[PDB]
Amino acid sequence: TGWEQVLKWLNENTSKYATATSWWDYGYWIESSHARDRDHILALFLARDGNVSEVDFESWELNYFIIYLNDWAKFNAISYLGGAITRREYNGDETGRGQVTTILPLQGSGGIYVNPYAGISVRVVQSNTTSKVTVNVRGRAECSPIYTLLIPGNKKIPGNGRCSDGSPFPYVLYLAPNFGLITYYKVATSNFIKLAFNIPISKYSGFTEKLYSNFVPVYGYGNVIVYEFRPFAIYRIEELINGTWKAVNSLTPGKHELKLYISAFGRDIRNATLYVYAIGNKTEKIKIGEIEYMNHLNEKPIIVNVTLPKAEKYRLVLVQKGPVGVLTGPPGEIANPIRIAREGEKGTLSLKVGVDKDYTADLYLRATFIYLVRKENAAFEPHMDTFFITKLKGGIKLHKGDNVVTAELNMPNGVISSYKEKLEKEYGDKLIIRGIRVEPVFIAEKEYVMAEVRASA
């Protein structure tokens, strides 16, 4: 399976207060040895592609994203929750009517493939003069995919999208040398496909290169892969050599003029400071530059000149304010920590917080709205809006481990009510609120890791 072995890792390898998430699974039986609203957002990440899928995971203070290949079996549920497909395509109405299989793995050495359970067979003639892909159903009858992508050859083979009986066959095929994959056209380039089966295809330009930099694999045992989440990361480094930008593989010591291709996943960059760690005989950190602001939906390359000391490795990091610390307590007020105080409620708020470094942080009360809007046979787009209600204390010195501060300031009455009706005036009817969260969070100058580059010459 892989869950127990992966959880053996992440216990000695990762930090004490390192948060992690995955899609809900029964593997939780060792994970204990979730939230129905954040499900829509997780599914929004897994089932979708490009800008739309760019979920603010840093708001959750996420450190690791664990993907699980077998979750293909649940992808119908994920797609529908992610806004990719309609109700009918998930289950349909009563006996009959089109239900869709969003993902269907194929076993086979190139180039025959087969799924023993559904009866599907796949022949790839790959010949001259006839390059074609044919999908036997073991039924009625012969189908032709929209197109078939070849991995790693990246050759795309066009098809009808039709069936032998003229019926529609809206599936994109993905053929690797050892395995195949039949995926519905609405999820053909989902992030899950990218991260689980390492199929680097996106509908949007340069997006996969970015994603793979924001989600770095640091472990992976069975059908389970552990990804280190990096909201801000460098996905390409180029150096100006002879008046020509040439892509860097390794950074030699000395003077360099680097073009840094930066990917900001889920959230923008606000007043940042760029650093480089020279990891050799000692950790000397040289500040390379700064970033005033970079929109995370339309990122752009950053040119920086830099002298590099002799070291075994280089760690480019970025520093800016962000959510630090976890709730190591329950937390007078007690009450649910994902909704600690309904509008217009006073008292105290005794909470304890676990941290891994020393932060001079401030304390806000954050509002998180997770909702749905009907865009269609019904299909719902998940939204997650985030905004600081009020500030509590600052600046408090949190040192490694647990910390306790009093914390007490009132929740205004009108805020989340007015916003809950600021959405309702905007949408229908179309609106479906799935989660209302009010939480205490600590914001401090946090060190985000962008990339690690080896040295040479």
Ligand SMILES: [Ca+2]
């Ligand atoms: Ca982005």
